[PDB]
Amino acid sequence: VHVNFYRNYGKTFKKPRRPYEKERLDAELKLVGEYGLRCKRELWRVQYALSRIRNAARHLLTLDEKNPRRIFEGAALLRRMNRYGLLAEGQDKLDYVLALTAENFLARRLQTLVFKAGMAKSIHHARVLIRQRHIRVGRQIVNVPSFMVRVESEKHIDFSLTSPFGGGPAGRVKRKNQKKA
Amino acid sequence: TAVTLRTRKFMTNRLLARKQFVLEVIHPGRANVSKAELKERLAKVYEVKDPNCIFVFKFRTHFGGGKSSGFGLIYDNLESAKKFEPKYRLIRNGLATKVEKSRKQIKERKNRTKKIRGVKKTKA
Amino acid sequence: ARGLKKHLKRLNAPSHWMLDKLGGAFAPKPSSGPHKARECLPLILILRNRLKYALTYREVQSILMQRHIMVDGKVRTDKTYPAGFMDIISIPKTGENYRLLYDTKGRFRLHSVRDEDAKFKLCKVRSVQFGQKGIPYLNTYDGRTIRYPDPLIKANDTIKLDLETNKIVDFIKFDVGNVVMVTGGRNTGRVGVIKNREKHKGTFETIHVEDAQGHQFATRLGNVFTIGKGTKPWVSLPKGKGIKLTIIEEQRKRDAAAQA
RNA sequence: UACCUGGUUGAUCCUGCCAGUAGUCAUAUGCUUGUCUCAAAGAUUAAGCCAUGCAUGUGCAAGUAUGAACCAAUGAACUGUGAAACUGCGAAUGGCUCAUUAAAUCAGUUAUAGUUUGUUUGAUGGUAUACUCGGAUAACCGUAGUAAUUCUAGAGCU
RNA sequence: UGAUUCAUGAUAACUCGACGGAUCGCACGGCCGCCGGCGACGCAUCAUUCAAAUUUCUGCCCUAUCAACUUUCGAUGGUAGGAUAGGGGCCUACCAUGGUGGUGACGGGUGACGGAGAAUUAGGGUUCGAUUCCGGAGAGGGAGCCUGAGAAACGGCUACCACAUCCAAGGAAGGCAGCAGGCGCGCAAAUUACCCAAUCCUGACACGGGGAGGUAGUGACAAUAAAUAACAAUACCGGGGUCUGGUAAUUGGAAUGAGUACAAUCUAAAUCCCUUAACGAGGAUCCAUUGGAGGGCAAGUCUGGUGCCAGCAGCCGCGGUAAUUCCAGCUCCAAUAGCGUAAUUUAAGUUGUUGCAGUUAAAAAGCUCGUAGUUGGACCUUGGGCCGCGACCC
Ligand SMILES: [K+]
Ligand SMILES: [K+]
Ligand SMILES: [K+]
Ligand SMILES: [K+]
Ligand SMILES: [K+]
Ligand SMILES: [K+]
Ligand SMILES: [K+]
Ligand SMILES: [K+]
Ligand SMILES: [Mg+2]
Ligand SMILES: [Mg+2]
Ligand SMILES: [Mg+2]
Ligand SMILES: [Mg+2]
Ligand SMILES: [Mg+2]
Ligand SMILES: [Mg+2]
Ligand SMILES: [Mg+2]
Ligand SMILES: [Mg+2]
Ligand SMILES: [Mg+2]
Ligand SMILES: [Mg+2]
Ligand SMILES: [Mg+2]
Ligand SMILES: [Mg+2]
Ligand SMILES: [Mg+2]
Ligand SMILES: [Mg+2]
Ligand SMILES: [Mg+2]
Ligand SMILES: [Mg+2]
Ligand SMILES: [Mg+2]
Ligand SMILES: [Mg+2]
Ligand SMILES: [Mg+2]
Ligand SMILES: [Mg+2]
Ligand SMILES: [Mg+2]
């Protein structure tokens, strides 16, 4: 026996049943361009996560409002949706969880929030800035653009202290240029 | 730069006669603080008379740098450490010598000698 | 197989040990002893996983070979010694004494006890019958044989045993209205008073227990352990006081703690 | 995502299948392949055949030292540390494979008032030269045999 | 105890009883030679624990072109034994004639070890389950044993069958379905590495050992995250002169990791990662591919070649001189560090229990009776109030 065999893993996305439908291709490309995604799989995994959350919410809506599992798991689901900024305060019911779209999840990415915070000129500039290790959430630098930012962590998105845009020293391009000068 | 030491999960393990803790090292501007430098800083911090009673290991710098975490033991005296500490850590601290052996060679010699009986086993 | 198993695969270990899935291929197989393998907490687990005194298997060996650990007043050097319910674990160097009780989630918890309270354990009488020479003798579920027991003591009784003198100093008759702790099943660690005993000929006997807050639960006779005469248990209980909480109330407690 | 599309006719509506469309902790194969984490891996056919090496040995204060063994001491049975060997224990676990096997294995659920169980834990133990019995044997030692093997005989000790 | 002529006591005897300590360590004090502590090892009994063995009920794929099977020589039961750790046709002697079967016995097939589970699933379902957890079984095929608490053990023995090794021909030695590795077989699968540091097991044992197990190597099985550029200015195209957008191997400075590497960290020792000096981008050649472009089905009725040939084409079809389909170039499309090709699920309400059909598309037996099976008319304590959703009363 190898102990490593017991580590779990799973798939994060599915491919569409119809590969070449014009309407779906246009909608996916519109979302990808709006949020600077690297491929369709990044949107497909968000759709996969939304599908699992929606299935959970629907299954508790098909149970009584006194069923102790619906009180408990619906409270947990609402806490998770409020924690990541996916739901407002007035939207405090399991019904509103069913109304969530992949747009709501894509709007909470570190790339989208870095772009909307003014730190980057474009969504693609935000993507490169995050992948260049210039962005920290709290004290932790995050080089992963699909990072889902909590509302309590939104106000702590900032330039890295080791980055030239965050008080750090100049990068190798600038330093080499001044050394040439 | 300013290396700040922070001990967490601290306990005084009297059964093994040592102090054990989680060591959090904050080193902005440094790659990582070496184990020897941490030993000297811990000897200063905990007033350790013999700094060969300090053992730090399992260090891990976080993603993005600037800070590291590891585990540290401080033995009340050098005899406690030489009795309770694993040999490889003593070798790391210079309190022991690494005996260079090949396990496979030991196995082959053991089989060959098991084929023989008596005091002539040593000469085989 | 052609004989006894010597190894416990880590996946096949008791779930109340809370052993992690990737810590290795193996779990400590409990040695034979006073408690059953599936219902005990081995000494190595207590020393390394719970009390954090030792960090490795070898460190547990080092601690135990120093003769630092006494189980119910006696020094044990076996790491897989099957310490079980109500056992006293004493370390007469740090001056700490532990009674192995169950929390309401079915997991053994080392409960700190006073020095005087560590001088006795509670044992459950398994059977009373005549031994050799016609001498009456008592046996318990923790493997002890006591000769010349009080004739008023019957099976399923709880006796109070003084570890220093090794005699029954007091006992409790298994009756309706005595506070009990459930030691097996899904209600393990729950504390309540017996309301009635439903007997069925030829099969297991069902005990109906109601806790202090009014919740009612039922369990077999083999999973009930009397801990006090009336509504006052003879030992101290862990923080939960044997009152199981639903996950909603646990979430309420967590929310209140986070808010504070 | 509780989904269909092309194909029989001059055209139509059907039945109906063919083909397409998606998945596979599903295998192989092809092309391609920068970084991180994770991870299966001679099962399918041959439970076919295997060179070589390794996979099981083991010593505490506490069974037995007189190595012609080592360190330290220097009229005493036995200093200590101890190889070897006898004695004790283990090698019935683990690992591997899925050939046989279709109420059989196996699963849940029973039973032993139908039995065995080294070990652990607890308790128990009275009517059968003694200031302590006898004979061997290993290691050791030296005569060997055989092409040869932890193949093997004889002699002297304890 | 649900239940025992049970636990257990007493008595009479019995047995050529492997029982009832001729063992070891440390400390060694108290009384006048005698007593004396803490241990270790060992014997026996009961209990407990670790377990096994046997055992109750229910439950398994396809096949009737398998309808009878079992019973000399055990088949079903009974009696008395023997044997076994113990129940039992388990075996023996005698006796009786039973036992199973369309509610499918018996037989055959399985490219059948069983389960936990796995894939796909609106629900229902279909298919898989050699493999790390549990159970079973085997160690070339059979068979038989010794030791031992525990084995019908195979990294134990004995023999036969089949292979096969060394030989001085007299003999001797065998069992990788352990780890690695090698032949062979194949569509199909890695190193003859390091180590007990972790997990844990084992021994006289804190110490030895462990191809259990871990570490590294190979490894696009599978899975996760995630680069291959971003910005600005000129010029163009714009759109909404101005405003604002997209374009250029244009022009500029910024950014950075792939890589290299001090070092530290990692580690049993190494290594990788994480961290980090110095270095490391312009056609940022630090150059992304795999399939397609008639329809299904996203994307060309562009150019050259071939001319029912070569070829493509899952299917429908294309190709005979103007080929949107072949061979190419250009361009475009999909997915993207991946994608193409060659059992099973979905699609399939094309197996239908949910949920399909049977006048004419495939499909009502020629007709009736009839056993099993399946399915079977209505009828029997209702009201009522009170207290208070429980209870009560009439
Ligand atoms: K068995
Ligand atoms: K043995
Ligand atoms: K069963
Ligand atoms: K029998
Ligand atoms: K009989
Ligand atoms: K034995
Ligand atoms: K180890
Ligand atoms: K050991
Ligand atoms: Mg469907
Ligand atoms: Mg095994
Ligand atoms: Mg009797
Ligand atoms: Mg009989
Ligand atoms: Mg088979
Ligand atoms: Mg299986
Ligand atoms: Mg097979
Ligand atoms: Mg395998
Ligand atoms: Mg298995
Ligand atoms: Mg076997
Ligand atoms: Mg073979
Ligand atoms: Mg055999
Ligand atoms: Mg073998
Ligand atoms: Mg074996
Ligand atoms: Mg490239
Ligand atoms: Mg089209
Ligand atoms: Mg073309
Ligand atoms: Mg039809
Ligand atoms: Mg017709
Ligand atoms: Mg017809
Ligand atoms: Mg009716």
Side-chain angles (χ1 to χ4, degrees):
Chain A
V1 48
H2 306 86
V3 195
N4 287 337
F5 166 74
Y6 300 135
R7 180 185 313 273
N8 285 328
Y9 60 92
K11 281 145 146 135
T12 54
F13 75 103
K14 310 167 272 233
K15 285 217 179 71
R17 172 96 218 190
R18 310 301 181 187
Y20 307 123
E21 171 195 334
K22 266 310 182 133
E23 239 186 56
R24 199 203 74 260
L25 294 167
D26 303 336
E28 303 173 346
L29 188 46
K30 183 178 179 180
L31 280 173
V32 164
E34 187 173 347
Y35 295 94
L37 310 188
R38 99 178 175 269
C39 50
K40 296 296 182 70
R41 150 177 191 155
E42 289 181 350
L43 162 74
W44 291 337
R45 75 196 172 183
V46 167
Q47 290 175 338
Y48 195 78
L50 183 50
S51 194
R52 305 201 307 310
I53 302 163
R54 250 201 290 251
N55 178 20
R58 157 188 20 204
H59 170 304
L60 308 174
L61 284 179
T62 308
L63 281 183
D64 289 345
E65 293 177 350
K66 292 191 173 182
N67 186 340
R69 166 180 189 179
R70 178 195 165 161
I71 307 181
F72 180 78
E73 286 199 7
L77 200 40
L78 293 183
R79 194 186 147 241
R80 184 171 316 108
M81 298 306 119
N82 289 27
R83 194 153 178 255
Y84 279 100
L86 301 164
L87 268 190
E89 296 190 1
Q91 295 174 319
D92 53 356
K93 294 287 190 176
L94 271 176
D95 219 307
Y96 305 109
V97 169
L98 275 192
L100 292 168
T101 64
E103 293 177 350
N104 306 71
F105 285 82
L106 283 174
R108 303 301 310 168
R109 295 169 50 105
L110 189 64
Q111 172 177 354
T112 325
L113 297 168
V114 155
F115 170 54
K116 307 303 182 183
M119 311 178 65
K121 320 187 184 82
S122 51
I123 202 59
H124 305 267
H125 179 230
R127 179 126 194 184
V128 295
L129 276 175
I130 295 150
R131 202 58 185 164
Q132 302 301 31
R133 297 167 63 109
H134 297 303
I135 308 298
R136 67 185 165 106
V137 176
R139 78 137 289 151
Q140 179 62 71
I141 95 159
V142 181
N143 73 339
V144 167
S146 60
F147 183 96
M148 284 306 278
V149 187
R150 301 167 187 178
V151 308
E152 59 260 38
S153 306
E154 226 182 317
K155 59 210 164 193
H156 302 134
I157 286 153
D158 179 69
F159 277 118
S160 278
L161 313 165
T162 165
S163 178
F165 315 100
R172 76 181 210 249
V173 174
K174 174 170 300 299
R175 298 187 301 103
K176 190 184 189 178
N177 286 340
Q178 330 189 282
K179 162 166 73 223
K180 293 179 179 179
Chain B
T1 89
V3 174
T4 300
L5 262 45
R6 256 184 262 220
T7 62
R8 291 265 200 61
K9 308 288 232 294
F10 186 101
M11 95 156 267
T12 319
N13 183 1
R14 293 178 179 83
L15 314 190
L16 292 164
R18 72 207 188 167
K19 307 156 169 203
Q20 32 194 57
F21 46 82
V22 167
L23 185 49
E24 265 154 48
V25 201
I26 291 134
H27 43 98
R30 306 260 312 272
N32 36 31
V33 184
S34 73
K35 289 179 286 190
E37 183 178 2
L38 299 165
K39 288 183 39 185
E40 324 328 335
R41 296 173 172 270
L42 278 176
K44 285 166 338 206
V45 175
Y46 284 94
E47 307 80 33
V48 186
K49 293 179 179 179
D50 179 7
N52 278 348
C53 290
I54 307 181
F55 305 81
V56 292
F57 49 82
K58 293 179 179 179
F59 276 102
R60 174 83 205 171
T61 312
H62 306 180
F63 174 78
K67 85 182 325 193
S68 286
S69 295
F71 208 84
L73 315 168
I74 304 177
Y75 281 83
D76 309 308
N77 64 34
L78 197 288
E79 306 71 20
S80 299
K82 293 277 207 57
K83 160 174 29 54
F84 301 132
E85 257 281 317
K87 204 197 147 32
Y88 82 82
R89 285 178 204 171
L90 306 165
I91 299 183
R92 286 181 182 179
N93 264 14
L95 306 174
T97 47
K98 183 178 179 180
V99 184
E100 294 294 328
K101 56 222 163 173
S102 184
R103 182 47 73 182
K104 193 53 72 197
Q105 294 300 320
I106 299 159
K107 292 183 161 187
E108 313 242 10
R109 179 185 191 300
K110 176 256 303 179
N111 291 327
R112 302 192 297 259
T113 43
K114 103 164 64 160
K115 254 83 163 303
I116 310 311
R117 178 179 176 88
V119 311
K120 330 206 307 293
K121 261 151 55 143
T122 65
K123 293 179 179 179
Chain C
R2 300 200 310 285
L4 294 156
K5 289 324 179 62
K6 296 308 174 186
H7 302 91
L8 187 58
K9 291 301 181 66
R10 196 175 188 92
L11 279 189
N12 184 30
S15 64
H16 53 105
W17 292 355
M18 301 179 272
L19 288 198
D20 69 28
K21 157 168 73 142
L22 298 180
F26 289 108
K29 206 206 181 199
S31 66
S32 46
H35 305 267
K36 289 199 145 293
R38 285 292 165 177
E39 188 161 68
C40 82
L41 191 58
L43 270 187
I44 172 150
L45 265 39
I46 298 164
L47 271 192
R48 167 188 62 174
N49 304 62
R50 298 286 189 271
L51 292 188
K52 307 298 185 182
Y53 283 128
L55 300 161
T56 42
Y57 185 83
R58 151 185 317 160
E59 226 158 41
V60 160
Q61 200 188 47
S62 281
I63 290 184
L64 279 168
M65 230 42 51
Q66 273 164 270
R67 290 178 81 76
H68 279 335
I69 305 305
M70 293 178 351
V71 179
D72 281 297
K74 295 214 217 162
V75 167
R76 300 305 169 183
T77 68
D78 204 82
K79 33 212 175 202
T80 60
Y81 187 77
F85 182 69
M86 276 279 183
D87 282 3
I88 302 285
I89 295 89
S90 79
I91 317 165
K93 195 196 203 308
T94 88
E96 245 300 280
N97 293 261
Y98 294 112
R99 203 182 291 282
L100 267 190
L101 303 150
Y102 285 114
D103 74 29
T104 42
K105 300 200 176 181
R107 301 151 334 183
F108 276 121
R109 285 297 172 211
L110 295 153
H111 178 69
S112 203
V113 296
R114 293 182 183 174
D115 289 345
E116 293 177 350
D117 282 345
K119 293 179 179 179
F120 72 94
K121 66 171 324 187
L122 288 196
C123 308
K124 183 182 181 181
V125 182
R126 170 200 312 263
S127 46
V128 187
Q129 65 272 291
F130 281 22
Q132 225 201 6
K133 300 295 184 180
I135 295 172
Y137 84 75
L138 187 148
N139 78 350
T140 66
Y141 288 98
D142 73 88
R144 309 183 150 284
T145 288
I146 297 150
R147 291 200 331 170
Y148 299 116
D150 190 309
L152 291 163
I153 295 169
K154 304 286 177 184
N156 296 144
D157 271 2
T158 286
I159 59 185
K160 180 174 179 175
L161 220 74
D162 184 1
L163 302 181
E164 201 76 358
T165 321
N166 194 21
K167 64 179 180 180
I168 304 180
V169 290
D170 204 1
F171 77 97
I172 303 171
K173 293 178 179 179
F174 187 83
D175 285 1
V176 159
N178 288 340
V179 70
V180 284
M181 180 183 266
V182 177
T183 63
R186 62 180 295 175
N187 307 329
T188 303
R190 286 187 82 173
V191 169
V193 299
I194 298 175
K195 279 306 188 318
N196 60 290
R197 326 169 37 181
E198 211 204 6
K199 281 166 253 53
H200 297 287
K201 272 166 159 17
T203 191
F204 55 87
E205 187 269 348
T206 300
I207 298 287
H208 282 91
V209 188
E210 190 223 83
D211 61 356
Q213 298 190 357
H215 310 91
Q216 273 138 351
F217 40 103
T219 171
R220 301 187 184 187
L221 176 102
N223 283 342
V224 180
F225 189 110
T226 311
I227 60 182
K229 205 270 163 273
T231 36
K232 177 31 190 133
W234 281 7
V235 291
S236 37
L237 286 177
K239 267 191 156 196
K241 293 179 179 179
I243 300 263
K244 198 171 189 179
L245 278 206
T246 76
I247 51 180
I248 299 208
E249 324 175 294
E250 307 173 20
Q251 230 277 327
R252 263 216 263 290
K253 280 168 64 233
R254 287 196 258 115
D255 186 2
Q259 187 274 331

